[PDB]
């Protein structure tokens, strides 16, 4: 065929670029970072109505101060989450402290280029890693299978991403409240999702310094959806 670690003539790794295409096919995930917390939301996208939607786990806890959302080949993320959790707990064991969000992200990204003829191919999933630490406060990172990660004030990944990103480019400012951020994630999801957003086929979460990382109940998110439709009817 041709080596798995081969460069294209343009200077890119074929297999990394091809993995990025699989991520484009994935369900939408959005993160917004505020000074009051970081919100993480995802489109669940159940392929059939008989599938019990709450068993779809695309937002995940890493430590009490770090959560993450995924988009792409979501099965590939299980071992990334496992490594992330291990890294976070291990560091606390060695140092009696919380591990920095960047350090955690960097550890996950070290996994990503360990493929060749080590795993057989790169990961087919991107992660939004969000958390809090004392030095740098609230943080959102986008970790790709290239091994690169970027810090974002807000970021979307998956099928509805550059549409949603254009929208985040407009709506984000440095004074967003957590409650505003929540509504924004819901709003932009509703825009790019195929079917109609409700509490069952989308999911919200946040990480705050005080209460740590929380996945929102459907009751809670349903109330925020109601609040959102009322805000928009009002101009």
């Amino acid at each position: 065929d041709r080596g798995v670690s081969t460069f294209s003539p343009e200077g890119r790794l074929f297999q990394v670029e091809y993995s990025l295409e699989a991520i484009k096919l994935g369900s939408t995930a959005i993160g917004i970072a505020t000074k009051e917390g970081v919100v993480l939301g995802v489109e669940k996208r159940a392929t059939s109505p008989l599938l019990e939607s709450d068993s779809i786990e695309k937002i995940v806890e890493i430590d009490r101060h770090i959560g993450c959302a995924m988009s792409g080949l979501t099965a590939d993320a299980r071992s990334m989450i496992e490594h992330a959790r291990t890294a976070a707990v291990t560091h606390n064991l060695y140092y009696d402290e919380d591990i920095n969000v960047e350090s955690l992200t960097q550890s996950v990204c070290d996994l990503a280029l360990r493929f060749g003829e080590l795993m057989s191919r790169p990961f087919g999933v991107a992660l939004l890693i969000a958390g809090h630490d004392a030095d740098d406060g609230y943080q959102l990172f986008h970790a790709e299978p290239s091994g690169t990660f970027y810090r974002y004030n807000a970021k979307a990944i998956g099928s509805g991403s550059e549409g949603a990103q254009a929208e985040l480019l407009n709506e984000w400012h440095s004074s967003l409240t957590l409650k505003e951020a929540e509504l924004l994630v819901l709003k932009i999801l509703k825009q790019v999702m195929e079917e109609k957003l409700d509490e069952n086929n989308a999911q919200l979460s946040c990480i705050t310094k005080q209460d740590g990382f929380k996945i929102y109940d459907n009751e809670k998110t349903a109330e925020l959806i109601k609040e959102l439709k009322e805000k928009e009817a009002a101009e």
Binding site: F7, S8, G11, L113, G116, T148
Partner: protein, 231 residues
């Protein structure tokens, strides 16, 4: 064409295409400049962002108190190579109580990159590096390319549109080589050089990364407000 499927194959003209393709990743990378006097050595690097919501990718990495580099190309490869340097600097300290000479750091980097160009299953590194340091023979600037070729210079630049900065430095040579004892002037000159490689954009407070090492100065990085002085 038929000879570019892997690093273990020569073309009929004697070229290594996988290595040349790796060299291409450097050219798409953001610009960075290095230059030195007899007392200091400076790195300047233009950081690239993903969009207006994103941070600006960090381009400079510290290797020891007296050594560090800037990167252009695949960033994870720079992390791997800089980590290797951190260890080699470290081994030289722990075992020999000796600070690793910049010249040796270059030879070790050359030899590491080379092995990935002669074996099956491996791939060349997709990053270029500008290594500055102050050691027992003074200030030094090195240029690493993933072909394995390491070169000692007074100044240089790599990345997109690096050719502009490279000629500026080629002109300025006799001027900036003299800037002994003035750190802020050597930086000023480096910032002027990287400016020959700008187009459409210019230097902002979170755009610009400067690093310096020298006679009585540990290798230290300046980002954010700490570079406004030079904009």
């Amino acid at each position: 064409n038929n000879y570019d499927g892997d690093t273990v194959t020569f073309s009929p003209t004697g070229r290594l295409f996988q290595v040349e393709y790796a060299l291409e990743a450097i050219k798409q990378g953001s610009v960075t400049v290095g230059l030195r006097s007899n007392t200091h050595a400076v790195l300047v690097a233009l950081k690239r962002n993903a969009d207006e919501l994103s941070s600006y990718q960090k381009k400079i990495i510290k290797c020891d108190e007296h050594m560090g580099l800037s990167l252009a190309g695949l960033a994870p490869d720079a992390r791997v190579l800089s980590n290797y340097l951190r260890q080699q600097c470290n081994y030289s300290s722990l075992v020999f109580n000796r600070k690793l000479a910049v010249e040796r750091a270059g030879h070790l980097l050359c030899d590491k990159a080379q092995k990935n160009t002669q074996s099956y299953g491996g791939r060349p590194y997709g990053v270029g590096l500008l290594i500055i340091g102050y050691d027992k023979s003074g200030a030094h600037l090195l240029e690493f390319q993933p072909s394995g070729n390491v070169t000692e210079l007074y100044g240089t630049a790599i990345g997109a549109r690096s050719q502009g900065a490279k000629t500026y430095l080629e002109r300025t040579l006799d001027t900036f080589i003299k800037i002994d004892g003035n750190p802020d002037e050597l930086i000023k000159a480096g910032v002027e050089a990287i400016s020959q490689s700008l187009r459409d954009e210019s230097l902002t407070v979170d755009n610009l990364s400067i690093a310096i090492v020298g006679k009585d100065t540990p290798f230290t990085i300046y980002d954010g407000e700490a570079v406004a002085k030079y904009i």
